[PDB]
Design a binder for this molecule. Structure first.
Ligand SMILES: CCCCC[C@H](CC(=O)NO)C(=O)N[C@H](C(=O)N1CCC[C@H]1CO)C(C)C
Ligand code: NI
Ligand SMILES: [Zn+2]
Length: 137
């Protein structure tokens, strides 16, 4: 895979729900490989031109994939999160993020998963889910 150029339309497009049970194992392997090759701690389908709701992470309290991730709970107000993005190398943006989130979805074997995250890991989850909605830093 390749991390798309900063002017790619896919970065602003909405990623489609993955049909329940679809085999995404190779896709997740490829995405994880693209993420680590580019030196990132997360990656979303849009960034590699895959308009499917899949994210991969290697963050302090969560490492792995989430299929069809959704934020089901978050803290009120916002905190400071300085973020760069692999799709826009060179740029760091002071983002407002929820300090804590719960994300739910499925793993590669279609088992339901729940991730309770705070700080950096919460920021990563929000950053990647944003990508799936075509929202970038
Ligand atoms: C921080 C919220 C999630 C950031 C995820 C990005 C990767 C990305 O573009 N995902 O879509 C990353 O690894 N960004 C790094 C990044 O922003 N980091 C890594 C350490 C913490 C934070 C810098 O404040 C670098 C490459 C810019
Ligand atoms: Ni490649
Ligand atoms: Zn990004």
């Amino acid at each position: 895979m390749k991390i798309l150029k900063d002017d790619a339309p896919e970065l602003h497009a909405i990623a489609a729900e993955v049909p329940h049970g679809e085999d995404v194992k190779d896709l997740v392997l490829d995405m994880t490989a693209a993420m680590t090759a580019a030196g990132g701690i997360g990656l979303a389908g849009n960034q590699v031109g895959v308009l499917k709701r899949i994210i991969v992470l290697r963050c302090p309290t969560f490492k792995g994939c989430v299929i069809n991730p959704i934020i089901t709970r978050h803290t009120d107000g916002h905190v400071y999160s300085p973020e760069g993005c692999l799709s826009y190398p060179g740029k760091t943006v002071a983002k407002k993020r929820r300090n804590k989130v719960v994300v739910e979805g499925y793993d590669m074997d279609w088992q339901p998963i729940t991730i309770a995250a705070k700080g950096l890991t919460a920021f990563c989850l929000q950053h990647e889910i944003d990508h799936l909605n075509g929202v970038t830093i």
